[PDB]
Each structure stands twice: as C-alpha cells, then as structure tokens.
C-alpha cells in the first residue's frame, strides 16, 4: 500500500523440442511494463506500458542484453537443478525467480526480495536482512553455501536498495498519470436463489485500482473469488453468501479500498 517494482522469470525445460522457455515480465505495482519471451519474433525486451515506450534505444538494447543473460543463466540452472535431484532428462521441470524492491509512501526503500523456486516449491530465498538466505532442501543448501562464499547476497542488496528503487521512483514519475492514480471500486449486489428456501446474495467490487481490496460479509460460509483483472487496468472481485429466505436484510457487504475514504456498506434493499 505504497509502491513496488518486481520482475518475474519462468524457464521451463522442453525436453527434445529445443531449448527451454523463458518469460521475463516486469511489473510496477499492478501494472505490467516490459516482457521477454523465449519464442518471440523480436527477441528484444518489449514495452507493455506507454510510459516505458519513451525509453531510448540504449535502454531497450540494455534490458534486452541483460534479459538474455538472465536466460542463459536460467537454462544452466535447470540443468544444474536436474543434477541435484537426479532427474531424468526425460521430464520437464520449471524454474521461477522473482526479485525487486518495495518503496514506502515517501519513495524510500522498504524491502527487497530475491528468491527462486523449483517445480513450484521454494528452493532458496534472500532473507529480509538481504545478507542471509533461506535454503529449502539439502540441495538448496548447496546453492546457499556456494552463494554465501561468493557474497552474492551482498551484491543483490546493492540492487534492491539502490538501483531498483531509483529506477522505480523514475518509473512512478515518468508514468505518474497511470501509476499514481487510484480508482474507487464500483460496487453493487445481486440476488440469486439456490432453491426455494435459499438464495445467493452476491457483492461486487468492479473497476478499481490498485488490486488490493477487502470484500466482507456479515449477518463463515462465504465464497470469495480471487481479484481478477478486467483488462483495462482496473480489477474486479466479488463475494457471495447463501442467505436463508426473507433473511437478506440481515446481511451486509462491506468494501474496503484505497479509493474509498470511508468504506461502503451495501445491503440488499
């Protein structure tokens, strides 16, 4: 509830059908700004947000450069990770890494995180103290020991704390008009019935930005679906409760969002 910039990398081993798959997409808050796709035609870092389009060639050449290094690195990792676990070259496996910095209301550093995962589980993650690491397997400790000898941990700390927040503050200003904006949730409710003695009272929060929001019911027995994006920068989410009959007045939905100074309490009336 301040600001952040996080990159996400996913490299999947495609055994026998070429090289792995790699996707590097960059996010500023809930807004995607750049991407890279193993199997794209451009093979350069592409813009996915207008405030990023303005960046000179030297930048794009820059990130494209750095992004593919991230690629070579990630295909080496897969091979290395297969060895540790003694897995057959047959099956496919996934590598995911994510790192970036968090910045407060003042655009000053707050946190940083590296962390990597193999086949959907945590492998190793940089401790909040950006000095230590959290190793998961005994294999993950190999990587930890090694990384501790090289002082990789302290080379990252310089990034999360330095160049990351800088480039983040730079992103927020350069794209201010979209990033530094909020959108109060456009709420409403519906009444559907399950049977002849039960009805599904549903509460909606649409067109809001950022994605953080709190949908809450109250007369335990509440369906909540995960905040989904509408596709135009705003997000949606709804909450439902199977209310007994003629009992809909005793149910209140509550909305909480950065854009609502005071919450919205909407009742079926």
């Amino acid at each position: 509830g301040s600001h952040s910039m996080r990159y996400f990398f996913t490299s999947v081993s495609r055994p026998g059908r070429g090289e792995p798959r790699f996707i590097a997409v960059g996010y500023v808050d809930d807004t995607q700004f750049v991407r890279f796709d193993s199997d794209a035609a451009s093979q350069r870092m592409e813009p996915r947000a207008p405030w990023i389009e303005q960046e000179g060639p030297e930048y794009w050449d820059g990130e494209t450069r750095k992004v593919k290094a991230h690629s070579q690195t990630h295909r080496v990792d897969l091979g290395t990770l297969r060895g540790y676990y003694n897995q057959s070259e047959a099956g496919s496996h996934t590598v995911q890494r994510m790192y970036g910095c968090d910045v407060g209301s003042d655009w000053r550093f707050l946190r940083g995180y590296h962390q990597y995962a193999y086949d959907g589980k945590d492998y190793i993650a940089l401790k909040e103290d950006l000095r230590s690491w959290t190793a998961a397997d005994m294999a993950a400790q190999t990587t930890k020991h090694k990384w501790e000898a090289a002082h990789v941990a302290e080379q990252l700390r310089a990034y999360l704390e330095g160049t990351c927040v800088e480039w983040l503050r730079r992103y927020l200003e350069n794209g201010k008009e979209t990033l530094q904006r909020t959108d109060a949730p456009k709420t409403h409710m519906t009444h559907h019935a399950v049977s002849d003695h039960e009805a599904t009272l549903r509460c909606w929060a649409l067109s809001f930005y950022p994605a953080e929001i709190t949908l809450t019911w109250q007369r335990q027995d509440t369906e909540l679906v995960e905040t989904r994006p509408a596709g135009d920068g705003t997000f949606q989410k709804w909450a439902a409760v199977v209310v007994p009959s003629g009992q809909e007045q005793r149910y209140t939905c509550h909305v909480q969002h950065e854009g609502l100074p005071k919450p919205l309490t909407l009742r079926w009336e």
Partner: peptide
C-alpha cells in the same frame, strides 16, 4: 529495470 547468478 532488471539486475543474475546460477542456482
């Protein structure tokens, strides 16, 4: 933008 070491 970005930064990576082998795992």
């Amino acid at each position: 933008g970005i930064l990576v070491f082998t795992x």
